[PDB]
Amino acid sequence: NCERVWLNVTPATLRSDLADYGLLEPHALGVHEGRIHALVPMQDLKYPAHWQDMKGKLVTPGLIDCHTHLIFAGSRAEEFELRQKGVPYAEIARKGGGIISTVRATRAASEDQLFELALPRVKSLIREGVTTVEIKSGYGLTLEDELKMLRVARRLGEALPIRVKTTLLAAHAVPPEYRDDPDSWVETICQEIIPAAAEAGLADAVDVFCEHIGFSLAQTEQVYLAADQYGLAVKGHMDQLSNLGGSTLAANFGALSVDHLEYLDPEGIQALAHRGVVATLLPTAFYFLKETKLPPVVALRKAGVPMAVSSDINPGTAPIVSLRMAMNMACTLFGLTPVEAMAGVTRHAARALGEQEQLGQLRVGMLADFLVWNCGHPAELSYLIGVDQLVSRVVNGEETLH
Numbered sequence: 001n002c003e004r005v006w007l008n009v010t011p012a013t014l015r016s017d018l019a020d021y022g023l024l025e026p027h028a029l030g031v032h033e034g035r036i037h038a039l040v041p042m043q044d045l046k047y048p049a050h051w052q053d054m055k056g057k058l059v060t061p062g063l064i065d066c067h068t069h070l071i072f073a074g075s076r077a078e079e080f081e082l083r084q085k086g087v088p089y090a091e092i093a094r095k096g097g098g099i100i101s102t103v104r105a106t107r108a109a110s111e112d113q114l115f116e117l118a119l120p121r122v123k124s125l126i127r128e129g130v131t132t133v134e135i136k137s138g139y140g141l142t143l144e145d146e147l148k149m150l151r152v153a154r155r156l157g158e159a160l161p162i163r164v165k166t167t168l169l170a171a172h173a174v175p176p177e178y179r180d181d182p183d184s185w186v187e188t189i190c191q192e193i194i195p196a197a198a199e200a201g202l203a204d205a206v207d208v209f210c211e212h213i214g215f216s217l218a219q220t221e222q223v224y225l226a227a228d229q230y231g232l233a234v235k236g237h238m239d240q241l242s243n244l245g246g247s248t249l250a251a252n253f254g255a256l257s258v259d260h261l262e263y264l265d266p267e268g269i270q271a272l273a274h275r276g277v278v279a280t281l282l283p284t285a286f287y288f289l290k291e292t293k294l295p296p297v298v299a300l301r302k303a304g305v306p307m308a309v310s311s312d313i314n315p316g317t318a319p320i321v322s323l324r325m326a327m328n329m330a331c332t333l334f335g336l337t338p339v340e341a342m343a344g345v346t347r348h349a350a351r352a353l354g355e356q357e358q359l360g361q362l363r364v365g366m367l368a369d370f371l372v373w374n375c376g377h378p379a380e381l382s383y384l385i386g387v388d389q390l391v392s393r394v395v396n397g398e399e400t401l402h
């Protein structure tokens with residue numbers, strides 16, 4: 001008893017209780033009020049005519065990119081070129097290069113301009129099969145500019161057939177105006193930005209860049225405390241350049257996830273395992289930054305810590321708008337299997353966004369966010385990159401290709 005039905009689909013359920021991809025024999029998938037209402041093997045059936053026959057095509061949950069900075073203005077391309085040519089970073093920086101140039105360009109960009117700049121980026125993720133994307137602020141570094149980014153994020157979720165989770169990342173770096181008083185900036189975030197963002201219902205979570213050239217463990221704790229007071233979930237950019245113990249702090253605050261982790265240690269891994277925190281791998285940033293210190297994948301696996309994989313789309317360290325390329329890199333650079341990568345962009349990605357109960361698996365009762373592909377096996381999703389392969393892209397039970 002459901003409005004729409006997809007006949008003859010070969011489901012890669014990605015169910016948490018099923019091995020590998022949770023692939024099953026051909027089934028019939030029916031949706032009711034935006035949710036998967038029923039999953040019945042075809043042998044138990046023998047339509048109406050509005051029922052769509054997929055003729056055995058593979059179906060999977062919609063992909064999820066749980067860590068992006070896709071909203072931004074300006075371009076760091078010229079700066080990159082100069083570096084490749086051999087110009088010292090000091091010269092580039094003294095002339096205002098680096099993350100600050102993105103901040104100035106983004107502050108200067110109007111809300112309408114950021115929206116128009118982000119549209120084409122989100123459309124590329126959409127055609128790859130991404131149905132839920134997380135977008136962070138962090139390039140505003142002022143109360144008005146940080147919320148401006150969050151508003152653009154909400155706008156994208158309303159204008160396009162894709163779910164958007166917003167994350168306040170005001171603690172991405174210390175703005176120029178607070179250069180000599182970092183703690184003053186932290187107070188602003190805690191006493192003004194988080195409260196204003198929460199009051200407007202603009203933030204689903206709060207993030208922090210905890211590092212030596214970022215925010216200290218103490219300053220990071222101040223932020224999580226404020227988030228806590230407004231009932232906002234927390235997460236953080238941890239152990240990317242060094243270990244300050246940030247992952248353990250985040251775990252103690254019930255973080256949804258910790259991201260990067262190149263320098264994560266055993267103690268931290270133990271904390272993550274115990275608090276059920278998701279470890280988010282960002283292979284693209286690792287690639288582009290030409291890093292050599294690999295995240296402790298083997299240890300994370302041994303401890304059973306779920307690992308999500310994300311594109312980390314951002315103008316500074318990962319200018320690649322592709323979730324699937326990230327999956328390919330997680331396998332090639334971090335040694336993940338195609339099945340770990342797939343769970344990394346479904347089941348585990350959902351959990352990293354606090355949506356473990358609603359998305360990421362083809363189970364009765366969960367939201368109807370699924371994809372019908374023209375390729376034969378799910379392993380191919382992490383393998384062949386750059387080709388449009390969607391036959392059907394369903395979000396909340398409704399077709400979105402046309």
Ligand SMILES: O=C(O)CC[C@@H]1NC(=O)NC1=O
Binds near residue numbers: 209317
């Ligand atoms: O440089 C940028 O624009 C963002 C870099 C990005 N943010 C962070 O905390 N780590 C990264 O790699």
Ligand SMILES: [Fe+3]
Binds near residue numbers: 067068069237312314
């Ligand atoms: Fe990031």
